[PDB]
Amino acid sequence: AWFLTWMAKHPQRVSRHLSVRTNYIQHDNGSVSTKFSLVPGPGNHWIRYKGAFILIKRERSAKMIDIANGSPFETVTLTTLYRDKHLFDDILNEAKDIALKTTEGKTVIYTSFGPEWRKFGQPKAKRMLPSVILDSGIKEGILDDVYDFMKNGKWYSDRGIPYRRGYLLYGPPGSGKTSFIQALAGELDYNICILNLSENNLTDDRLNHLMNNMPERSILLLEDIDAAFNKRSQTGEQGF
Amino acid sequence: AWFLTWMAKHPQRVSRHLSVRTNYIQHDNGSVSTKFSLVPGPGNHWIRYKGAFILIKRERSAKMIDIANGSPFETVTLTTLYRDKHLFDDILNEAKDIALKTTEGKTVIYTSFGPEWRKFGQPKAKRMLPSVILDSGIKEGILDDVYDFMKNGKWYSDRGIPYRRGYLLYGPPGSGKTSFIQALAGELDYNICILNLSENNLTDDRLNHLMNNMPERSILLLEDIDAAFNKRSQTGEQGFHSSVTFSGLLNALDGVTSSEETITFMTTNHPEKLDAAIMRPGRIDYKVFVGNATPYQVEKMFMKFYPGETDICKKFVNSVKELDITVSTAQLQGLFVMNKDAPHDALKMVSSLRNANHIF
Amino acid sequence: ASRVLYRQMIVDLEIQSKDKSYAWFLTWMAKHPQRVSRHLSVRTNYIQHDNGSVSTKFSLVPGPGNHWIRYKGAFILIKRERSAKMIDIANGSPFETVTLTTLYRDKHLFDDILNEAKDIALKTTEGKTVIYTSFGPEWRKFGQPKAKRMLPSVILDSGIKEGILDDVYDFMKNGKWYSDRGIPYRRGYLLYGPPGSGKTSFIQALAGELDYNICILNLSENNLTDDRLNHLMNNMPERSILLLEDIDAAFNKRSQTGEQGFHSSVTFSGLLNALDGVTSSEETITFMTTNHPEKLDAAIMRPGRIDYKVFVGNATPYQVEKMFMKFYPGETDICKKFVNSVKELDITVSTAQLQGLFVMNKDAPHDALKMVSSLRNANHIF
Amino acid sequence: AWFLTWMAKHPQRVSRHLSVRTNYIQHDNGSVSTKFSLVPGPGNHWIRYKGAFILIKRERSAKMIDIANGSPFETVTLTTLYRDKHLFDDILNEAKDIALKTTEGKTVIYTSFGPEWRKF
Amino acid sequence: AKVEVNLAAIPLGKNVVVKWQGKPVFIRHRTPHEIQEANSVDMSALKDPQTDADRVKDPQWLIMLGICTHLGCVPIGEAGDFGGWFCPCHGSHYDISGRIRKGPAPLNLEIPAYEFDGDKVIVG
Ligand code: FES
């Protein structure tokens, strides 16, 4: 369908036939948002792409119905001369980006729910790394190190090392540590997995389950780990 | 459907073929609703639309059945010469508006159910800003504040701040703070997500989850925040077990919270019980006091209830000056509703304002 | 060319099987006298009762094939087509279409036919009231749709009826006033009196008058909660009247039972919040009744919570004679001897007692008179 | 489908027809990973393999639907001389390797919660 | 995605297991004694305080997904000292309202989105 949307955008056609595609969203407040696009629809159209003439033949199935959308099956059949560059790759690529451009993607924050990891709010917009500042030698001092670890996978894997790395940021007062972590994760394009050891009702086995089994390409962040040290069994000597 | 309904209402057309569409809703009480509409149905039709002849051909497949609609598939084929404006856009847009003539903008009010929000009652009709009376400056001050905040969005994003706002409306009760919040949300076209910390069993984790998974395009209104602070010292020995945690509230306010232009309005009646620690930029940014009814408020509300009766309001304000008493907004409202179109009587029973809390 | 011009002069209309108009028109045409139909199809309706008894009825409808009818002196061509490929999965039957054809020189003369079809449906609007109950967080029918009862049937003290009717009409007519003020559009009426004063009957009669359904809630119910209370009175069905009964359950004990954890938990805070704050305001009329007004709380008779209160005491002699002639239409001067008999009796009597003693045997009026001396203690025996 | 995938990469091919096969994965973060593959699609094709020309045909069976896949029932076929070696076994073996290369033999560790093991 | 369940088929006090998305679902038609007892508890004991009206809209019918909330294993109804649900994996106890009352479980059983259809109930 990206091809249809792209073809709507591309000028220099002969599109004698047309079809309407409607998007109708019913907001809970009563109002509704509607948008209206005229796509080529059935019939045969023509294109002049980069000096190459491409015929487009929409077809609507005379028997089938697609359960995936509850609509008759359709096919889009391009046609041209072999002598061309096979620009189909080019047109498909420059139609794909239109779909891609609509949603670039953002950073997602996960949080614990029992043993499971699940999202916590809508995807937060990417925080650019320069937007957070620290003492000189610090931000780059972490950035270069993590980049080195990212590329040293061979240095670990071919020699049987656990391909893990752990960092500690122990700023006493609290100055943008979490902000820096989130900025770095967005910069690396990694979702953030938050966990606070100060959380009540957190067990060792459930923790070990959660620190593993993470969502793919995610960075784990353990806040205020000192709770594990300080909150010894004395607070729960009865067995809490 | 929109286009068929539209063309059924087009005067300049010829349609040999027709078909019936019936609306049938059986009321619970035993009454019933019936309504016919002879749509063009299958065949061919001609329509002339502002100078352009268009042939309309409707057909239904003899082999498809739509699972959703439970009916055979149908299509409507328009056709006309190329040299037109592609007037199909005009016709079809016309069909759009006529279907959506309702213009049903409302103001939903959500409410917490466990860790998720739930629509509470039918979408209430919009209530405009002037319907509620507040002291001079306070209202418009809040309006311009919030407008500046929403408009100045890219500022927050670029300069590394999570783009959250917090407004505190504190003062003695019976001032219609909640009503004003509702009016403001309706004005801004935003739903309301009430969440009363008072007399509500909230666990700080659940509180954070609710405030951060709020539906989009919705203003968060926390009611009586002071309850949490009160239970910081009370429930530890009382056992109200509906207390949440102040530290959780701070984390639920700033820690990893939402950033989608989230705007939060908080109210209280006991500011003394609040501490100057929750008050910081990014959590309670612009606070205002809302005291008892002032002269400005009484004049404005009397004109709201009795437009054009300025002299009557003059007698009334003389009377209340003579009384020289402190009254909240809600009590003074009762005078005029029980005298819907009888301001002279409200003038007569001015002496009863001392006992307004009992019968009036 | 011939077919083209033919279709140019004549209207042809189709009715899919999905529309109720399909069956309605089939039924109508089955009844039409001026008909020439040489095709038929049976339709049999079955309902097997719980005990095995079965009710049967059949009817012949035109069925597939062409027909010929004349309606208002105009000829019409029916043509019922049976689909040979489709199965209407909703109805579990093949698709059908009944199409009509007519010259267009006259009007289609067709909205008339479907209005005749409407007349069959119009007979079903006789049921005119339903009782709604708090089955849970929402309202559901308590039973079969009750039959409306006429307002003069219930006979309260003179003026009370008229005052209540006038006041509620006044509230309802001027909704635009409430909209303009921005004040919530809801009003409250409190009925207080001794038990058996026909208060609930009066409310039901009024609901019948204005066609609204009744929403019953008893605050002596032991499993009510103020949160669910606030939910119910704001999730109420449309075209409804909310009737609250034994509101004194909150007056007498308030939160004492709630702290004790014994029976119902609803208290004043539930009343206040569910009356004004965050409440439904599009439209609502609320009725409260209380058998023990003596425990009233001075914070409630204020606008926004309630505005109308009226005592409903023992039936007056006016009520006595009115209901006597209700049970015994006509029967003049028997009512006279009865009214002075009860005046000599000179005791407090609820309208329920009078109803009971006028109905216990379906008495002749003199028969009711003969034993009327025992009303001093008739609550014991009769 | 392995056969079509193999044929797409086979250079000694004459294919006037093509069809688009798209692998699309939507990540939870809103980022999208997409690929396209120009498989031969319907119509006749010719391929030379070990000096033998093997005609090929692809056909979308109307009046059918594969309910599990939810597409019209497709069918592919090859043709060549019975007299000379029918190399279909060899062709399939070649195509199979294109799938087998993907897996390096991951080790999987299970762990016990309740009276049953599960992946960890 | 959506699972439709006939409520009338369930007698009073009888639990059910239903697979929504593959996740288990418990349907229990509570008795008034259960309602009174559950509403009579003290929130202080609960590790995850919550009230019956806020756990589920209808006191008649009680819904949740059958997962321990400690690990992925499923509990079993009509078991445990508290007469509700019990988990045979690490001994987490759940009261009649599916509220963790004792054990390593951190949270009460979560509730999915559901809608009442009179005779039937639509869960999803
Ligand atoms: S997983 Fe069930 S008790 Fe721990």
Residue numbers in the entry:
A (entry chain C): 97 to 336
B (entry chain B): 97 to 456
C (entry chain A): 75 to 456
D (entry chain D): 97 to 216
E (entry chain H): 92 to 215
Question: What is written in the article reporting this PDB entry?
Answer:
For bc1 complex (complex III) assembly, the iron–sulfur protein Rip1 must first be imported into the mitochondrial matrix to fold and acquire its 2Fe–2S cluster, then translocated and inserted into the inner mitochondrial membrane (IM). One protomer consists of three domains, a transmembrane helix (TMH) at the N-terminus, a Bcs1-specific β-sheet-containing middle domain and a C-terminal AAA cassette.
Rip1-FeS introduces asymmetry in the matrix vestibule by exclusively contacting the AAA domains of four Bcs1 protomers, henceforth called protomers A–D. It binds to Bcs1 with the 2Fe–2S cluster binding subdomain (FeSD) tightly packing against protomers C and D while the large (base) domain (BD) is exposed to protomers A and B. Based on resolved secondary structure including several side chains in the Rip1-FeS density (left panel and Fig. EV3), we could position the FeS domain with its N- and C-termini facing towards the seal pore locking up the IM vestibule. In Bcs1, we identified two highly conserved charged motifs, the EWR motif (E212-R214) and the DDR motif (D300-R302), that contain residues exposed to the FeS domain of Rip1. Second, the EWR and DDR motifs—together with F209—formed a module that contributes to substrate contacts in all four interacting protomers. Thereby, a characteristic positive charge distribution pattern is established in the matrix vestibule that is complementary to several negatively charged residues, e.g., D139, D145, E201 and D210 in the Rieske substrate. Indeed, we found that Bcs1 charge inversion mutations in the EWR and the DDR motives were not viable in YP medium containing glycerol.
